[PDB]
Amino acid sequence: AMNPYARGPNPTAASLEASAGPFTVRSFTVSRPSGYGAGTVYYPTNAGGTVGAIAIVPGYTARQSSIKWWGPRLASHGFVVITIDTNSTLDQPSSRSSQQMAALRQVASLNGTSSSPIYGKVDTARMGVMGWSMGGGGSLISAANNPSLKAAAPQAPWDSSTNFSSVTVPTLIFACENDSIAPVNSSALPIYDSMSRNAKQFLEINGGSHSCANSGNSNQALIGKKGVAWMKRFMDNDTRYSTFACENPNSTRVSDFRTANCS
């Protein structure tokens, strides 16, 4: 049956691995950030309908630059994306989560503000969370606390606690094989194994350092394909993307692939 959220032409591996999707992207800096430090909004000009929104948070000491590449990559496939700086560079995961949710809230405000470039462009019922390291831990906290979120795709997550057993939101964990800041054995993998209630996926990048999914990474084709496919499948209920979302990509750039409850 027709999916009112489907946007864009039918996907291929090549179209998803490309540096950009079908839609023209513009961006702006949020003038008066509400509940977080600073933000940049990326949006499609010509998506053909309202789109979901995704809020992305950096790691400790880090800024938007570390996660910026997701903004154009996701927006060009039909999402509104807000990348944030935190109130302090030394904010911890819980605070990062609150700020992430504040950023989504502001996206909803701007959707209703006629002066904004994103006026009327957002479906405020359909949201997702992403982020690096402690910002990835924050993303998981956001999902735990707000199960109406449609998707979560943290990268190299870290939190003091690895128990996210309550999470019912579809969650893709990007992991970095050689991470020594948040080692996979003590962070990303126990987090992944804790979650028994959801669609989930574990994608570990072969030879990756802790920054393996950050801006400038050497795996933007694969990582971008997977992120976009996960968000399309789960934020847009778009079953054109189910295979790309759920499949083992059979890539030598991947040292560990796992998934559950994905169809």
For each of the domains in the chain, give its residue range(s) and CATH number, in order of start: 1-263 (3.40.50.1820)
Consult the annotation and say whether 60 binds a ligand: yes
User: Which H/E stretch holds residue 43?
Assistant: strand 38-44
Under DSSP, is residue 127 helix (H, G, I), strand (E, B) or coil? strand
Half-sphere exposure of 56 (CA within 13 A, CB side): 32
Experimental method: X-ray
Rg (CA), the chain: 16
Residue 156: both structure tokens together:
């190299």
Under DSSP, is residue 89 helix (H, G, I), strand (E, B) or coil? coil
* Residue 133 bears catalytic tag: yes
Q: What's the gap between Cα 38 and its chain centre? A: 18
CA dist 76 and 228 (Å) reads: 10
Under DSSP, is residue 190 helix (H, G, I), strand (E, B) or coil? helix
| Dihedral of alpha carbons 155, 159, 163, 169, sign | negative
| Dihedral of alpha carbons 156, 240, 253, 219, sign | negative
Q: Work out whether strand 200-205 and strand 51-57 pair parallel, antiparallel, or are unpaired.
A: unpaired
Distant-in-sequence, close-in-space partners of 210: CB < 8 Å, separation ≥ 6: 133, 156, 176, 179, 180, 181, 182
Q: Work out whether strand 25-29 and strand 38-44 pair parallel, antiparallel, or are unpaired.
A: antiparallel
**Look-up: residue for tokens 């789109």?**
51
Out of 179, 187, 211, 236, pick the active-site residue.
179
* Residue 77 bears catalytic tag: no
Instruction: Determine how many CB atoms are found less than 10 A away from the CB of residue 259.
Output: 17
Residue 89: both structure tokens together:
């560079």
CA dist 185 and 142 (Å) reads: 23
CA dist 120 and 87 (Å) reads: 28
Distant-in-sequence, close-in-space partners of 111: CB < 8 Å, separation ≥ 6: 118, 119, 120, 121, 122, 124
Out of 76, 95, 133, 211, pick the active-site residue.
133
Out of 210, 211, 236, 238, pick the active-site residue.
210
Distant-in-sequence, close-in-space partners of 24: CB < 8 Å, separation ≥ 6: 44, 45, 46, 76
Instruction: Determine how many CB atoms are found less than 10 A away from the CB of residue 48.
Output: 12
Backbone phi and psi for residue 181, each to the nearest 5 degrees, phi listed first: -95, -50
CA dist 116 and 109 (Å) reads: 10
* Residue 238 bears catalytic tag: no
Backbone phi and psi for residue 203, each to the nearest 5 degrees, phi listed first: -125, 105
